[PDB]
């Protein structure tokens, strides 16, 4: 249930002081916001930190750190492909609830009417 | 510039009289004088070198010259003839109405060589101006009609809006196999690389000898990479040491000449290999003329692409 709006705004007839002070009219727009790109972070550092540990103990000799190096190499490749996968599925909307573009065409057909006709 | 029916009728009377005049000028039978003859006679009598043909003298039939004009769409009483007049797109919406009506009747009852007409061809069948979204909506409605169990009546209609497209086969052409005075079978072809032009004669049988302007290929091409290019066509089809070649090349540098000979030999070699081998040579890049030629220098810049230094500010 949506919180109540009765007696919340400063208005003629409302004795109490206002509960809410919206800087924008509380009226539904005919559009939703655009999918916000998520903040990226450094990845695979756990694998990167196992490779750089063996080096410290093996005088940076790749011959002794093969398994750890191959791990970090594969982890970076997976994260490189993963970004390529996500991007495609993000545009397609395979996992999204709906696309802002598709969800706005639907609102265009049923526009909010704050005025009388 | 509207053109009335009386105006076009007069223009056709002039074209038929002038058609007989033009035939009389050239001493040809006026009865068998075709439009191809008219164009030939007009090009002789009025020679124009203008690069754009549309700007050259023309004596065409009025129907070909003048644009299509819609006739008046209402009578003397002012009543429009078509019940969809007030849409402004009566021809387009009458077509959508006809296609939508057929889709309904089907429910009650129940590629390579063809394309959909373009918007500019629909805009002429209808004699109206169309938006891009109007064109899409009409095509989306025709596609929805093919997926249904359309009968013969519903197939002549869809074919009106389909235009036959002539696919061009990529299959490589084969040179004729000729015979010399001694009876040795050979083929001949030509190749171009940059400014080099080569003509190669590939003999059906041989020992692997290649003569370039009368010289042994290793003496003519002392650079090993130029010789690898000569090897490439024969090696790719497993025919090293099986053919004799006599080729002549002029123009270009050493590398361009090796490329021109490579293409000439490969094209001529196609006469002595199986069709499947010719398609493998095509797919290996051995039968395509390289279009990469030197680009002209432009004025105001150092090279074909390089610009003069952007002066320090």
């Amino acid at each position: 249930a949506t919180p109540s709006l009765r007696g919340r705004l400063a208005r003629f007839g409302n004795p109490r002081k206002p509960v809410l002070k919206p800087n924008k009219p509380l009226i539904l727009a005919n559009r939703v916001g655009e999918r916000r790109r998520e903040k990226g972070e450094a990845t695979c550092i756990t694998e990167m930190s196992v490779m750089m540990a063996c080096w410290k103990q093996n005088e940076f000799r790749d011959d002794a750190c093969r398994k750890e190096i191959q791990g970090f190499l594969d982890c970076a490749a997976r994260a490189q492909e993963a970004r390529k996968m996500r991007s495609i599925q993000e545009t397609l909307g395979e996992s999204g609830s709906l696309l802002p573009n598709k969800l706005n065409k639907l609102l265009q057909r049923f526009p909010n009417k704050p005025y009388l006709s | 510039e509207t053109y009335t029916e009386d105006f076009i009728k007069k223009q056709i009377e002039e074209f038929n009289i002038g058609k007989r005049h033009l035939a009389n000028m050239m001493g040809e039978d006026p009865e068998t004088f075709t439009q191809e003859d008219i164009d030939r006679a007009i090009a002789y009598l009025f020679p124009s070198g203008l690069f754009e043909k549309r700007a050259r003298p023309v004596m065409k039939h009025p129907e070909q010259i003048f644009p299509r004009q819609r006739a008046i769409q209402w009578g003397e009483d002012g009543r429009p003839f078509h019940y969809l007049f007030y849409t402004g797109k009566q021809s387009y919406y009458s077509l959508m109405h006809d296609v939508y009506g057929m889709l309904l009747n089907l429910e009650k009852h129940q590629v390579i060589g063809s394309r959909w007409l373009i918007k500019e061809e629909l805009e002429e069948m209808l004699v109206e101006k169309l938006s891009d979204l109007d064109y899409m909506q009409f095509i989306r409605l025709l596609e929805k009609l093919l997926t249904s169990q359309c009968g013969a009546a519903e197939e002549e209609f869809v074919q009106r809006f389909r235009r036959s497209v002539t696919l061009e086969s990529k299959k490589q052409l084969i040179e004729p196999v000729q015979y010399d005075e001694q009876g040795m079978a050979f083929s001949k072809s030509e190749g171009k690389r940059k400014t080099a032009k080569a003509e190669a004669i590939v003999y059906k049988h041989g020992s692997g000898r290649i003569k370039v302007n009368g010289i042994d290929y290793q003496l003519y091409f002392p650079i090993t990479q130029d010789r690898e290019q000569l090897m490439f066509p024969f090696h790719f089809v497993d025919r090293l040491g099986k053919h004799d070649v006599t080729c002549t090349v002029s123009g270009g540098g050493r590398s361009a000449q090796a490329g021109a000979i490579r293409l000439a030999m490969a094209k001529a070699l196609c006469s002595f290999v199986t069709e499947d081998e010719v398609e493998w040579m095509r797919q290996a890049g051995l039968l395509t003329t390289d279009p990469r030629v030197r680009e002209r220098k432009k004025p105001g810049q150092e090279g074909a692409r390089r610009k003069f230094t952007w002066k320090k500010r």
Binding site: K39, G40, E41, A42, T43, C44, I45, M48, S49, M51, M52, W55, K56, F60, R61, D62, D63, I69, F72, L73, A76, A79, Q80, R83 | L167, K170, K171, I223, T224, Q225, E228, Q229, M231, F232, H235, F236, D238, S255, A258, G259, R262, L263, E279, W280, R282, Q283, A284, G285, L286, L287, T288, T289, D290, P291, R292, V293
Partner: protein, 208 residues
């Protein structure tokens, strides 16, 4: 480009074509019937169907080419491969029957392994943050690892420290050093690893 987008690159591989039909999958069968309708670019004048073709050596040769002088670049490459092979035959004939088994005499095997021993596993990218640029350890794609191994080898041989030594003698000596995990190019790789290690704490500054 003078090729329209419709032109596809040529596939120069004799084996790819002699492969029998039965072995082909329904996906590979579609690609083969598709290419028969496509436009094919002319084969470049570099790569051929020769069995002696090596894409890595051809690439290393181009990175040595100055001002379009491929003849000279190719000459230096073959002189380096000959100099490597002769140095290994001399080490082979002077060795004992036991040591002879461990001595490699193929210059292509040495060339490839020498570069693989110089490829860096991690890299560093500069990132602007808080008004100071920071070096940040970042994974490197395989293309970039191979390029850096070649560029470091050629750069080392062009260094002025070498006085009057010809390129085929310099490069041959550097390849055999790297083949044995020695020399200045291997040190350059280790330094990049040490700098990336010392900047371990700054890995988070990366956002991809």
């Amino acid at each position: 480009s003078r090729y329209s987008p419709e032109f596809k690159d040529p596939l120069i591989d004799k084996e790819y074509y002699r492969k029998p039909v039965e072995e082909l999958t329904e996906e590979e069968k579609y690609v083969r019937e598709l290419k028969k309708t496509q436009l094919i670019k002319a084969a470049p004048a570099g790569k051929t169907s020769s069995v002696f073709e090596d894409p890595v050596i051809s690439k290393f040769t181009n990175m040595m080419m100055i001002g379009g002088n491929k003849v000279l670049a190719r000459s230096l490459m073959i002189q380096t491969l000959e100099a490597v092979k002769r140095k290994q035959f001399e080490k082979y004939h002077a060795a004992s029957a036991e040591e002879q088994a461990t001595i490699e005499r193929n210059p292509y095997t040495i060339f490839h392994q020498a570069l693989k021993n110089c490829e860096p596993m991690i890299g560093l990218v500069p990132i602007l943050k808080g008004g100071r640029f920071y070096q940040v350890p970042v994974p490197l794609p395989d293309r970039r690892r191979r390029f850096l191994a070649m560029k470091w080898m050629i750069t080392e041989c062009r260094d002025k420290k070498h006085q009057r030594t010809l390129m085929p003698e310099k490069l041959s000596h550097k390849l055999l050093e790297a083949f044995h995990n020695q020399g200045p190019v291997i040190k350059r790789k280790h330094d990049l690893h040490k700098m990336a290690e010392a900047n371990r704490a700054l890995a988070h500054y990366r956002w991809w």
